[PDB]
């Protein structure tokens, strides 16, 4: 399971590069790179990543934007690729491999609003996803969501699993060793974290008493479904996959398939710390608990 050319390799994170190039066109450049991430205290995973993050950096575009995407493969020996669930594309032409030390550019439209998974598409896809090559792209709906004016504060959360290192038998046949949440920044000052068992417990997300919170969520897997629940509240409104039409109300828990997304909104009525879980409690026990700290001011 050890790739000789990855020994000792720890490529420092590289910032996502994005720039708008027209009213409906956006350039995005990512890397594929090999980066050590502390997934549990004392446990380093030499992850296969986009940009040195796992899950990868957040991408946000508008409905109707065409994405001109470049992948720069920094892995010395493994090809990598990109599949955005947001886009309409030819997989065999547009989600193809970029060889080590090369770049590739691929263009495709994001026609549909929502909270989409992205991930590496190189065979075996399970191997590339499980080693860390997953993330979220949000496509903002042209006309918003009907409840936009009620939302006071918003964050992005992503659920993923971690297995035994680069172990295809475990990836296929074993239970996850860890299941984790991470948060990816939407506005300056938001946290930006990797999938680990501890950061969002020790540095909770912050909010203020009485606020309606929106979370953009996706369960990237690779393998498990998620029973997403915020303790001490009920979801006022849920939009499955973030499409405004798929509108549920008053859900205690949102069932997410592997790669499933949602926009969920809830009110926090009292000061305190509110756990955020997958209610599949074996997974929660193995790391998948984040915290939301609600104060009279909204500051820690």
């Amino acid at each position: 399971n050890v790739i000789a050319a990855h020994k000792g390799v720890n490529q420092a994170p590289v910032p996502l590069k994005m720039e708008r190039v027209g009213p409906h066109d956006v350039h995005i450049e990512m890397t594929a790179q090999i980066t050590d991430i502390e997934i549990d205290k004392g446990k380093i995973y030499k992850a296969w990543t986009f940009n040195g993050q796992a899950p990868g950096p957040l991408v946000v575009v508008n409905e109707g934007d065409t994405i001109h995407f470049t992948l720069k493969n920094m892995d010395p020996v493994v090809p990598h690729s990109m599949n955005f669930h947001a886009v309409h594309a030819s997989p065999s032409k547009d989600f193809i491999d970029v060889m080590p030390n090369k770049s590739g550019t691929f263009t495709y439209p994001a026609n549909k609003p929502g909270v989409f998974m992205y991930h590496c598409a190189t065979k075996p896809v399970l191997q590339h996803i499980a080693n860390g090559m997953h993330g979220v792209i949000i496509v903002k709906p042209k006309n918003g969501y009907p409840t936009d004016k009620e939302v006071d504060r918003e964050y992005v959360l992503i659920q993923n699993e971690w297995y035994k290192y680069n172990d295809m038998n475990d990836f296929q046949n074993g239970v996850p060793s860890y299941v984790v949440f991470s948060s990816k920044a939407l506005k300056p000052g938001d946290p930006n974290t990797n999938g680990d068992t501890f950061t969002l417990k020790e540095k909770p997300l912050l909010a203020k008493v009485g606020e309606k919170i929106r979370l953009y969520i996706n369960n990237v897997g690779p393998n498990e479904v998620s029973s997403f629940h915020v303790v001490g509240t009920v979801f006022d409104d849920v939009y499955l996959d973030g499409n405004p039409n798929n509108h549920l109300q008053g859900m205690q828990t949102v069932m997410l398939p592997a790669s499933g997304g949602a926009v969920v909104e809830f009110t926090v009525t009292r000061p305190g710390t509110y756990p955020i879980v997958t209610h599949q409690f074996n997974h929660a026990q193995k790391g998948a608990v984040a915290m939301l700290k609600v104060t009279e001011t909204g500051e820690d």
Copy 2:
């Protein structure tokens, strides 16, 4: 996995205490207690329970009721707590531990209609849920459900798993040993049972030919999702989490996350016995089959 102070302990079930104290206020008193339950024939589980039942006793309130909840902890050594998924509360103030031989009182509103899980909230939550500290609270919608006038008969069903006794490794990493249904009484004469592999086979729920049946259902887990199905019928109407807005029709099978609820309604057209399953058939084989006996009169 054996707690010395639980040896030989078998605390007889204690009735739930509920009383309305105002037009929108209700007192509820439960216990936390250690009680032997026969989960399969010849198999005793010394369960951690509310009130000596696992799942615990049914709670029914109205939308807009504030619950003034008291937990009396009869466990000689383990703290326990209560988390109602129905309520808006501060988890770190209102879902806190009650020490052995003590009581605690916590007040919070049930603002949202539906079929909610409740459970102990004491760390490790997986341990407390898996050992039996789960249940359902139903919050009745102020304006009912649109199909109320069509329903002839109704029952509550709950799905849960059982693992190796108090074994955190198994709870986290193992398949369930048993998966089971129980029924909790809504009206005098309804059965009231615990999560076991046999009672609802040997003493089926009863109905009459031609009736529309409503089931209030919740899959409390701890770990598995449920593929809820009634053999020989199709769900005419489904309300996800019991919120009247989340209205599906003509479903063969309802996907429930861990902690997921629903109101489901179906018509039984012919005399006979109708199995009720999770269609994840490994779980059905390990206990999760209940029976509905439909007769020309509705009596056995």
Copy 3:
């Protein structure tokens, strides 16, 4: 796990027999038979089947049709039966066993539109399903689907698992050895395949650039849920269980319970080959990837 009377038995497939006998009445005759199926290259499973296919042959009826169903049991020693999820029936009278070398006839209505599982109902049901006795019945809605006029081409896909041969311990407690797709023909010229790891990769489904494709899908299990996703597109419209009322839009991935169905519709915008997966990637790795080849003409 070896049944002596099945040694060397390989009953050649028998065609489904269907004929309409009135404006709202249809005769269907199936067999139960024991047939060797190559589920992975070099791996034969001596399946328990309807008609020598696993999943079994496709059945299509109209909403409001009463089905007069005959099962001819060709198994020399095991009883078999039939449960259609489409129908309202008495399970203990209408889904009963047919003994070896006998036939039984059962009549029941299909009142509800959708994409329903069918399967053998003989105890242990897990054993009969896992050994291959599953399939789909489609009930066409009297008034169609609102998007009917947009659909250019349609196919049926079914997901199932395969375990160690006739091994009840594995069926209950083990991970699937294979997870697979098959396609069942709706119109002359459509492929008709069994649940295997390779046929729909080597002989992809065919379509033409720009088309809107409808898939009628069901995850028959026995045990797993499915995270159904088409690479390179987004589902424009989804009807859960194939009921026109259960209408979602813009889903990346559709969560299917065990026995869950859907009608899903999506547009393929560019020439190429488009994988079709369960996004639970351990299952995809173990076989559950089909291909859709999209050409400028629609022919290979």
